[PDB]
Amino acid sequence: SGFRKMAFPSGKVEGCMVQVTCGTTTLNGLWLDDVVYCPRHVICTSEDMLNPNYEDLLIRKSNHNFLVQAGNVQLRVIGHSMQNCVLKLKVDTANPKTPKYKFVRIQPGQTFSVLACYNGSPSGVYQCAMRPNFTIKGSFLNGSCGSVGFNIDYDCVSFCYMHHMELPTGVHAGTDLEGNFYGPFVDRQTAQAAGTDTTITVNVLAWLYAAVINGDRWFLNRFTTTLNDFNLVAMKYNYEPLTQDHVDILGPLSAQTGIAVLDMCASLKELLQNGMNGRTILGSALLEDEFTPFDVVRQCSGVTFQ
Amino acid sequence: SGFRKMAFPSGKVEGCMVQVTCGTTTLNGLWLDDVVYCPRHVICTSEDMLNPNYEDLLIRKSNHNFLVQAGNVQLRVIGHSMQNCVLKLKVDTANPKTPKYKFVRIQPGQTFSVLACYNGSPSGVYQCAMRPNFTIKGSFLNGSCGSVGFNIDYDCVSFCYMHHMELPTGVHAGTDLEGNFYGPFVDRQTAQAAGTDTTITVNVLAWLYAAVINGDRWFLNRFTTTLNDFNLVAMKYNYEPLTQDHVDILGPLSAQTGIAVLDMCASLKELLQNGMNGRTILGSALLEDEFTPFDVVRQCSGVTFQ
Ligand SMILES: *[C@H]1Cc2cc(C(C)C)ccc2Sc2cc(F)ccc21
Numbered sequence: 175s176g177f178r179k180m181a182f183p184s185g186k187v188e189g190c191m192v193q194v195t196c197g198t199t200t201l202n203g204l205w206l207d208d209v210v211y212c213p214r215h216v217i218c219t220s221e222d223m224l225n226p227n228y229e230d231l232l233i234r235k236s237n238h239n240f241l242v243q244a245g246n247v248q249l250r251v252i253g254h255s256m257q258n259c260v261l262k263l264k265v266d267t268a269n270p271k272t273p274k275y276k277f278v279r280i281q282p283g284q285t286f287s288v289l290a291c292y293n294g295s296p297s298g299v300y301q302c303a304m305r306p307n308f309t310i311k312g313s314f315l316n317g318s319c320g321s322v323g324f325n326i327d328y329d330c331v332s333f334c335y336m337h338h339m340e341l342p343t344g345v346h347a348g349t350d351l352e353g354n355f356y357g358p359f360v361d362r363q364t365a366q367a368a369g370t371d372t373t374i375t376v377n378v379l380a381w382l383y384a385a386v387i388n389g390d391r392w393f394l395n396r397f398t399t400t401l402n403d404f405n406l407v408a409m410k411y412n413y414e415p416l417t418q419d420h421v422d423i424l425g426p427l428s429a430q431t432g433i434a435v436l437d438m439c440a441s442l443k444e445l446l447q448n449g450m451n452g453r454t455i456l457g458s459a460l461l462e463d464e465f466t467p468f469d470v471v472r473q474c475s476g477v478t479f480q
Numbered sequence: 481s482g483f484r485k486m487a488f489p490s491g492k493v494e495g496c497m498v499q500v501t502c503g504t505t506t507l508n509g510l511w512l513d514d515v516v517y518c519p520r521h522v523i524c525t526s527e528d529m530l531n532p533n534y535e536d537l538l539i540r541k542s543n544h545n546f547l548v549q550a551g552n553v554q555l556r557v558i559g560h561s562m563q564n565c566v567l568k569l570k571v572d573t574a575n576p577k578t579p580k581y582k583f584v585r586i587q588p589g590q591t592f593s594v595l596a597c598y599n600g601s602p603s604g605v606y607q608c609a610m611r612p613n614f615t616i617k618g619s620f621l622n623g624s625c626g627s628v629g630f631n632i633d634y635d636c637v638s639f640c641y642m643h644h645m646e647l648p649t650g651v652h653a654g655t656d657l658e659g660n661f662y663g664p665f666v667d668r669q670t671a672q673a674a675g676t677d678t679t680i681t682v683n684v685l686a687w688l689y690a691a692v693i694n695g696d697r698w699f700l701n702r703f704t705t706t707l708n709d710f711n712l713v714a715m716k717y718n719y720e721p722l723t724q725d726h727v728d729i730l731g732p733l734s735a736q737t738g739i740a741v742l743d744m745c746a747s748l749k750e751l752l753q754n755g756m757n758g759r760t761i762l763g764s765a766l767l768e769d770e771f772t773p774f775d776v777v778r779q780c781s782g783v784t785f786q
Pocket residue numbers: 199201215216217218219220221223314315316317318319320337338339340481
């Protein structure tokens with residue numbers, strides 16, 4: 175028993191992290207097979223970031239201007255290209271530690287692990303969610319760009335995020351591994367504001383199920399609700415609307431606990447209307463929304479990775 | 481910017497995890513050089529755990545009764561011994577992935593990362609603290625025993641915890657890697673109750689510093705206090721007494737922020753007396769106490785590991 179905000183084991187990704195330096199600028203890259211993926215703004219100075227013309231800045235760069243270092247060993251760059259907002263640096267050596275992997279573009283509400291790195295070296299691992307406004311709430315200092323987010327299914331790493339930007343409000347924006355930003359964000363130092371940070375309703379419900387499983391049940395009540403009635407409260411509290419698809423996804427947790435999804439919605443509705451009255455749920459005094467239903471099932475079942 | 485509950489990169493420890501089976505019972509072991517460390521209750525059945533005589537149960541076990549598997553490859557056991565509450569299984573092959581390591585016995589209030597494993601396979605990583613009552617609040621299902629807790633300084637893994645028991649109240653107990661339990665707990669299925677779960681005051685103060693650094697400052701007030709006056713409030717709220725040693729440890733965070741330690745104590749005192757009035761600090765609605773001062777400095781500075 176016990177329920178913790180739990181990241182995937184990070185070793186498979188650690189083996190892929192390298193340093194990339196272009197002129198004055200150093201950040202992180204991801205070495206898979208014979209390609210190193212990194213943010214294209216490695217080519218920019220701080221000045222350039224106000225108004226960069228990436229294609230023009232790139233003209234002045236040759237393969238030998240991209241210094242790529244894997245631990246203590248230098249990699250030879252034999253080609254480079256820009257794809258959307260990432261550079262692909264072809265090197266002459268396949269990474270011997272390349273895991274089975276996929277590139278995935280995740281949907282808002284999905285969770286993933288981040289391996290925060292500096293100078294190609296891992297500093298720590300933590301769990302994030304893609305927020306409904308397409309930001310993430312991470313921990314990224316200068317030099318962390320190129321750190322990645324990922325999920326693992328058994329033996330296969332699904333990379334879903336690369337870090338590129340901190341907004342002035344302190345939240346974080348980045349791309350998939352094809353270099354397309356999540357949301358409307360651009361790799362420019364401008365006024366980019368995030369929209370409403372709505373709460374991921376299906377994840378809160380999953381977490382309430384996790385609570386019940388792991389002993390915390392004070393919030394269960396005598397009531398039920400309907401999808402439309404619940405969503406009238408969701409809107410008021412800036413929660414995502416709950417859909418039939420969400421109910422279906424919660425089916426397995428409903429079956430394990432015997433608590434109908436709509437009954438748990440009535441519990442959540444009461445918590446939103448009345449607060450927690452100074453009580454806690456799984457050690458938190460607010461409603462946690464960065465566990466997916468699949469996260470709850472996995473952690474409560476002990477699924478492992480090859 | 482951003483501040484997250486952040487675990488150490490887990491790869492160095494992943495490479496040390498093995499499966500240990502004795503008769504009917506399977507749990508995890510830690511393979512360093514040519515020794516596998518695991519909980520001695522691998523030799524017990526569920527029945528045995530009510531009242532085990534470990535020395536008597538061990539007499540019936542030979543080297544070939546301890547099945548040790550590292551991924552798909554079986555290790556040959558050439559000797560075994562019991563040290564306190566762990567078994568040391570000597571195998572004929574040194575782990576080629578052995579990192580630089582130390583065994584450390586930590587003090588209450590110190591934090592560490594846990595690599596939760598099942599059947600020798602990693603499932604996830606998260607950050608814990610040794611509570612003042614010598615429990616930890618983990619996420620451990622049946623089969624997780626032998627999972628370890630650790631810290632990393634650059635290239636060297638300091639192992640500090642091995643998981644052995646879940647108390648009836650759902651919190652967790654275990655040993656250092658010499659097999660000595662933290663606190664009064666024993667590897668028996670009995671009535672073992674945990675004492676008061678007091679809050680780690682110096683860690684809360686460190687976390688308030690982290691908040692100020694990362695933008696959250698609404699709780700700063702016009703007041704100061706003294707150690708003795710603050711501790712009169714600490715006692716009331718089941719917080720550890722703050723000592724001069726603690727103040728000294730917070731010195732560097734005091735210097736970076738310009739907020740005197742005793743001024744931050746006055747902020748904390750107001751938060752304890754008045755609550756948070758429905759506000760949040762670094763995304764939490766309660767006072768977080770599982771970040772040490774060194775954790776805050778590390779995460780806010782971007783320290784990395786070899
Ligand atoms: C990473 C990216 C970054 C790039 C540059 C150069 C001008 C290209 C300067 C500064 C940064 S700072 C940064 C800050 C964060 F909070 C997260 C990621 C980065």
